[PDB]
Write a protein that binds this ligand. Structure first.
Ligand code: 4L6
Length: 271
Protein backbone atom coordinates (compact mmCIF):
# COMPACT_ATOMS: atom_id res chain seq x y z
CA UNK A 1 0.00 0.00 0.00
CA UNK A 2 2.94 2.35 0.73
CA UNK A 3 3.94 3.00 -2.89
CA UNK A 4 0.39 3.61 -4.11
CA UNK A 5 -1.69 6.73 -4.78
CA UNK A 6 -5.51 6.60 -4.82
CA UNK A 7 -5.43 6.18 -8.61
CA UNK A 8 -3.01 3.24 -8.27
CA UNK A 9 -3.76 -0.49 -8.39
CA UNK A 10 -1.25 -3.16 -7.37
CA UNK A 11 -0.93 -5.49 -10.38
CA UNK A 12 -0.24 -8.32 -7.92
CA UNK A 13 -3.93 -8.05 -6.96
CA UNK A 14 -4.91 -9.15 -10.48
CA UNK A 15 -5.82 -12.62 -11.71
CA UNK A 16 -5.83 -12.92 -15.54
CA UNK A 17 -8.71 -15.02 -16.95
CA UNK A 18 -9.27 -14.56 -20.75
CA UNK A 19 -8.62 -12.20 -23.69
CA UNK A 20 -11.52 -9.84 -24.48
CA UNK A 21 -10.26 -7.99 -27.56
CA UNK A 22 -7.77 -5.54 -29.02
CA UNK A 23 -7.50 -1.97 -30.37
CA UNK A 24 -5.18 1.02 -30.70
CA UNK A 25 -3.44 0.36 -27.37
CA UNK A 26 -3.37 -3.44 -27.75
CA UNK A 27 -4.95 -6.28 -25.80
CA UNK A 28 -7.63 -6.13 -23.09
CA UNK A 29 -8.14 -9.12 -20.78
CA UNK A 30 -10.83 -10.15 -18.32
CA UNK A 31 -9.59 -10.65 -14.79
CA UNK A 32 -10.41 -10.63 -11.10
CA UNK A 33 -9.16 -8.04 -8.61
CA UNK A 34 -8.43 -9.47 -5.15
CA UNK A 35 -9.89 -12.80 -6.26
CA UNK A 36 -13.45 -11.55 -6.41
CA UNK A 37 -14.16 -8.42 -8.42
CA UNK A 38 -14.57 -8.54 -12.22
CA UNK A 39 -12.29 -6.14 -14.12
CA UNK A 40 -11.04 -5.50 -17.63
CA UNK A 41 -7.25 -5.07 -17.81
CA UNK A 42 -6.08 -2.85 -20.67
CA UNK A 43 -2.49 -3.96 -21.27
CA UNK A 44 -1.07 -0.83 -22.93
CA UNK A 45 1.33 -1.78 -25.73
CA UNK A 46 4.83 -0.38 -25.26
CA UNK A 47 5.31 2.75 -27.38
CA UNK A 48 1.59 3.20 -28.15
CA UNK A 49 0.73 5.78 -25.50
CA UNK A 50 1.96 9.09 -24.05
CA UNK A 51 1.97 7.44 -20.63
CA UNK A 52 3.08 10.27 -18.32
CA UNK A 53 0.46 12.58 -19.82
CA UNK A 54 -2.18 9.89 -19.52
CA UNK A 55 -1.32 9.15 -15.87
CA UNK A 56 -1.86 12.76 -14.93
CA UNK A 57 -5.18 12.70 -16.79
CA UNK A 58 -6.17 9.41 -15.12
CA UNK A 59 -6.41 11.35 -11.85
CA UNK A 60 -9.14 13.53 -13.38
CA UNK A 61 -10.80 10.53 -15.04
CA UNK A 62 -11.03 8.74 -11.64
CA UNK A 63 -13.63 11.35 -10.69
CA UNK A 64 -15.82 10.78 -13.77
CA UNK A 65 -18.63 8.42 -12.75
CA UNK A 66 -21.91 7.74 -14.46
CA UNK A 67 -23.92 4.54 -14.87
CA UNK A 68 -23.58 4.68 -18.70
CA UNK A 69 -19.85 5.45 -18.66
CA UNK A 70 -17.36 2.55 -18.41
CA UNK A 71 -15.82 3.11 -14.95
CA UNK A 72 -12.09 3.69 -14.52
CA UNK A 73 -10.96 1.74 -11.48
CA UNK A 74 -7.29 2.63 -11.49
CA UNK A 75 -3.93 2.32 -13.18
CA UNK A 76 -0.83 0.14 -12.71
CA UNK A 77 2.00 2.66 -13.16
CA UNK A 78 5.11 1.09 -11.58
CA UNK A 79 6.10 -0.93 -14.65
CA UNK A 80 5.84 0.78 -18.09
CA UNK A 81 4.17 -2.13 -19.60
CA UNK A 82 1.36 -0.19 -17.82
CA UNK A 83 -2.22 -1.32 -17.20
CA UNK A 84 -5.53 0.56 -17.17
CA UNK A 85 -8.14 -1.21 -15.03
CA UNK A 86 -11.77 -0.64 -15.99
CA UNK A 87 -15.33 -1.95 -15.60
CA UNK A 88 -15.79 -5.38 -17.19
CA UNK A 89 -18.27 -5.40 -20.08
CA UNK A 90 -19.03 -9.04 -20.80
CA UNK A 91 -20.65 -8.62 -24.21
CA UNK A 92 -17.77 -6.70 -25.76
CA UNK A 93 -17.78 -3.86 -28.23
CA UNK A 94 -21.02 -2.45 -29.55
CA UNK A 95 -19.87 -2.66 -33.19
CA UNK A 96 -19.41 -6.44 -33.05
CA UNK A 97 -22.63 -6.81 -31.03
CA UNK A 98 -24.69 -4.92 -33.63
CA UNK A 99 -23.25 -7.12 -36.40
CA UNK A 100 -24.41 -10.36 -34.80
CA UNK A 101 -27.66 -11.02 -36.67
CA UNK A 102 -28.83 -13.63 -34.13
CA UNK A 103 -29.87 -10.86 -31.73
CA UNK A 104 -32.79 -10.00 -34.01
CA UNK A 105 -33.06 -6.57 -32.39
CA UNK A 106 -36.30 -4.64 -32.07
CA UNK A 107 -36.07 -0.96 -32.88
CA UNK A 108 -37.02 -0.24 -29.22
CA UNK A 109 -33.72 -1.91 -28.26
CA UNK A 110 -31.81 0.18 -30.80
CA UNK A 111 -33.29 3.42 -29.42
CA UNK A 112 -32.37 2.31 -25.88
CA UNK A 113 -28.74 1.87 -26.99
CA UNK A 114 -28.80 5.44 -28.37
CA UNK A 115 -30.25 6.71 -25.07
CA UNK A 116 -27.59 4.87 -23.01
CA UNK A 117 -24.84 6.59 -25.05
CA UNK A 118 -26.64 9.96 -25.00
CA UNK A 119 -26.91 9.86 -21.19
CA UNK A 120 -23.16 9.20 -20.85
CA UNK A 121 -22.43 11.99 -23.31
CA UNK A 122 -24.73 14.47 -21.58
CA UNK A 123 -22.77 13.71 -18.39
CA UNK A 124 -19.41 14.23 -20.12
CA UNK A 125 -20.72 17.46 -21.67
CA UNK A 126 -21.77 18.68 -18.21
CA UNK A 127 -18.14 18.13 -17.09
CA UNK A 128 -16.87 19.92 -20.27
CA UNK A 129 -15.07 16.70 -21.17
CA UNK A 130 -14.84 15.80 -24.86
CA UNK A 131 -14.80 12.18 -25.92
CA UNK A 132 -12.84 13.03 -29.12
CA UNK A 133 -13.38 9.59 -30.75
CA UNK A 134 -17.02 8.66 -30.24
CA UNK A 135 -18.05 5.67 -32.43
CA UNK A 136 -19.60 2.21 -31.99
CA UNK A 137 -16.11 0.69 -31.69
CA UNK A 138 -15.67 2.76 -28.49
CA UNK A 139 -18.92 1.65 -26.88
CA UNK A 140 -19.17 -1.57 -24.86
CA UNK A 141 -22.05 -3.86 -23.86
CA UNK A 142 -22.43 -5.48 -20.43
CA UNK A 143 -24.04 -8.82 -19.48
CA UNK A 144 -27.44 -7.06 -19.17
CA UNK A 145 -27.25 -5.57 -22.68
CA UNK A 146 -26.62 -2.05 -21.35
CA UNK A 147 -24.38 0.04 -23.61
CA UNK A 148 -21.70 2.21 -22.01
CA UNK A 149 -19.25 4.71 -23.44
CA UNK A 150 -15.58 3.71 -23.20
CA UNK A 151 -12.07 5.09 -23.83
CA UNK A 152 -13.28 8.71 -23.50
CA UNK A 153 -10.52 11.24 -24.15
CA UNK A 154 -7.87 8.56 -24.80
CA UNK A 155 -7.13 9.63 -28.40
CA UNK A 156 -5.18 12.52 -26.84
CA UNK A 157 -2.46 10.04 -25.81
CA UNK A 158 -2.07 8.07 -29.05
CA UNK A 159 1.52 8.26 -30.32
CA UNK A 160 0.83 6.78 -33.78
CA UNK A 161 0.59 9.75 -36.17
CA UNK A 162 -1.54 7.69 -38.60
CA UNK A 163 -4.35 8.02 -36.03
CA UNK A 164 -3.89 11.67 -35.12
CA UNK A 165 -3.20 13.26 -38.52
CA UNK A 166 -6.47 14.27 -40.23
CA UNK A 167 -5.06 12.72 -43.44
CA UNK A 168 -3.69 9.73 -41.52
CA UNK A 169 -4.72 6.24 -42.62
CA UNK A 170 -6.28 5.63 -39.20
CA UNK A 171 -7.95 9.00 -38.47
CA UNK A 172 -11.73 8.66 -37.85
CA UNK A 173 -12.71 10.55 -41.00
CA UNK A 174 -16.14 8.91 -41.22
CA UNK A 175 -17.07 10.19 -37.72
CA UNK A 176 -15.81 13.77 -38.22
CA UNK A 177 -17.59 17.05 -39.05
CA UNK A 178 -16.37 19.36 -41.87
CA UNK A 179 -14.62 21.74 -39.46
CA UNK A 180 -12.53 18.88 -38.03
CA UNK A 181 -11.53 17.63 -41.48
CA UNK A 182 -10.85 21.11 -42.82
CA UNK A 183 -9.22 22.92 -39.90
CA UNK A 184 -8.92 20.53 -36.91
CA UNK A 185 -11.64 22.41 -35.01
CA UNK A 186 -12.64 20.07 -32.16
CA UNK A 187 -15.50 21.03 -29.85
CA UNK A 188 -18.60 19.79 -28.09
CA UNK A 189 -20.18 19.96 -31.57
CA UNK A 190 -17.68 17.50 -33.07
CA UNK A 191 -18.79 15.00 -30.37
CA UNK A 192 -22.39 15.81 -31.41
CA UNK A 193 -21.61 15.05 -35.06
CA UNK A 194 -19.94 11.74 -34.09
CA UNK A 195 -22.97 10.83 -31.93
CA UNK A 196 -25.20 11.23 -35.02
CA UNK A 197 -22.91 8.85 -36.97
CA UNK A 198 -23.08 6.45 -33.99
CA UNK A 199 -26.94 6.50 -34.12
CA UNK A 200 -26.57 5.72 -37.82
CA UNK A 201 -24.25 2.77 -37.00
CA UNK A 202 -26.76 1.44 -34.46
CA UNK A 203 -29.75 1.67 -36.80
CA UNK A 204 -27.62 0.17 -39.61
CA UNK A 205 -26.71 -2.86 -37.44
CA UNK A 206 -23.02 -1.95 -37.62
CA UNK A 207 -22.52 -1.13 -41.28
CA UNK A 208 -19.53 1.10 -42.03
CA UNK A 209 -20.57 4.73 -42.59
CA UNK A 210 -20.14 5.75 -46.29
CA UNK A 211 -19.29 2.08 -46.98
CA UNK A 212 -18.77 2.51 -50.73
CA UNK A 213 -16.41 5.49 -50.36
CA UNK A 214 -12.77 5.80 -49.38
CA UNK A 215 -11.84 8.22 -46.56
CA UNK A 216 -10.76 10.82 -49.17
CA UNK A 217 -14.11 10.52 -50.99
CA UNK A 218 -16.02 10.75 -47.69
CA UNK A 219 -14.21 13.95 -46.73
CA UNK A 220 -15.10 15.45 -50.13
CA UNK A 221 -18.75 14.23 -49.87
CA UNK A 222 -19.38 15.77 -46.49
CA UNK A 223 -17.47 18.99 -47.18
CA UNK A 224 -19.83 19.42 -50.18
CA UNK A 225 -22.79 19.22 -47.79
CA UNK A 226 -23.87 15.68 -48.54
CA UNK A 227 -24.74 13.26 -45.76
CA UNK A 228 -25.52 9.71 -44.69
CA UNK A 229 -29.12 8.79 -45.37
CA UNK A 230 -31.86 7.03 -43.43
CA UNK A 231 -31.17 3.44 -42.29
CA UNK A 232 -34.10 1.13 -43.08
CA UNK A 233 -34.74 0.51 -39.36
CA UNK A 234 -34.89 4.19 -38.42
CA UNK A 235 -38.31 5.86 -38.25
CA UNK A 236 -38.67 9.38 -39.67
CA UNK A 237 -38.46 10.77 -36.11
CA UNK A 238 -35.28 8.83 -35.34
CA UNK A 239 -33.74 9.91 -38.63
CA UNK A 240 -34.57 13.56 -37.82
CA UNK A 241 -32.62 13.22 -34.55
CA UNK A 242 -29.48 11.75 -36.16
CA UNK A 243 -29.63 14.18 -39.08
CA UNK A 244 -29.80 17.14 -36.69
CA UNK A 245 -26.29 16.25 -35.52
CA UNK A 246 -24.92 16.95 -39.02
CA UNK A 247 -25.74 20.62 -39.55
CA UNK A 248 -22.95 22.24 -41.56
CA UNK A 249 -22.90 25.11 -39.02
CA UNK A 250 -21.63 23.62 -35.73
CA UNK A 251 -23.60 26.11 -33.63
CA UNK A 252 -26.88 24.83 -35.16
CA UNK A 253 -26.24 21.30 -33.88
CA UNK A 254 -28.07 20.31 -30.65
CA UNK A 255 -26.53 19.71 -27.23
CA UNK A 256 -26.58 16.25 -25.65
CA UNK A 257 -29.25 17.50 -23.24
CA UNK A 258 -31.48 18.39 -26.22
CA UNK A 259 -30.73 15.09 -27.98
CA UNK A 260 -31.63 13.20 -24.80
CA UNK A 261 -34.96 14.98 -24.57
CA UNK A 262 -35.64 14.25 -28.27
CA UNK A 263 -34.80 10.56 -27.82
CA UNK A 264 -37.11 10.29 -24.79
CA UNK A 265 -39.88 12.02 -26.78
CA UNK A 266 -39.53 9.37 -29.49
CA UNK A 267 -39.55 6.55 -26.92
CA UNK A 268 -42.84 7.91 -25.59
CA UNK A 269 -44.32 8.31 -29.07
CA UNK A 270 -43.23 5.06 -30.74
CA UNK A 271 -43.17 2.60 -27.80
C1 4L6 B 1 -13.02 -0.83 -26.59
C2 4L6 B 1 -11.54 -1.15 -26.71
C3 4L6 B 1 -10.68 -0.10 -26.90
C4 4L6 B 1 -9.30 -0.36 -27.02
C5 4L6 B 1 -8.15 0.46 -27.21
N1 4L6 B 1 -7.09 -0.30 -27.24
N2 4L6 B 1 -7.45 -1.64 -27.08
C6 4L6 B 1 -8.82 -1.70 -26.94
C7 4L6 B 1 -9.71 -2.75 -26.75
C8 4L6 B 1 -11.06 -2.48 -26.63
C9 4L6 B 1 -11.99 -3.64 -26.42
C10 4L6 B 1 -12.33 -4.50 -27.47
C11 4L6 B 1 -13.20 -5.56 -27.26
C12 4L6 B 1 -13.75 -5.82 -26.03
C13 4L6 B 1 -13.44 -4.97 -24.96
C14 4L6 B 1 -14.01 -5.17 -23.66
N3 4L6 B 1 -14.88 -6.22 -23.41
C15 4L6 B 1 -13.64 -4.24 -22.67
C16 4L6 B 1 -14.17 -4.29 -21.29
N4 4L6 B 1 -14.01 -3.19 -20.52
O1 4L6 B 1 -14.77 -5.27 -20.87
N5 4L6 B 1 -12.80 -3.24 -22.96
N6 4L6 B 1 -12.28 -3.06 -24.12
C17 4L6 B 1 -12.56 -3.87 -25.15
Amino acid sequence: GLGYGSWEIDPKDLTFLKELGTGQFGVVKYGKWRGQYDVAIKMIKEGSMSEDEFIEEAKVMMNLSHEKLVQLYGVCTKQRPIFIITEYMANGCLLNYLREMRHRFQTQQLLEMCKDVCEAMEYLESKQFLHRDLAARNCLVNDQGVVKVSDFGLSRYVLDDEYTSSVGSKFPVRWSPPEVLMYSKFSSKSDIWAFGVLMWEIYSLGKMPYERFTNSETAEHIAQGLRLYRPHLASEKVYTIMYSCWHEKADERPTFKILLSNILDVMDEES
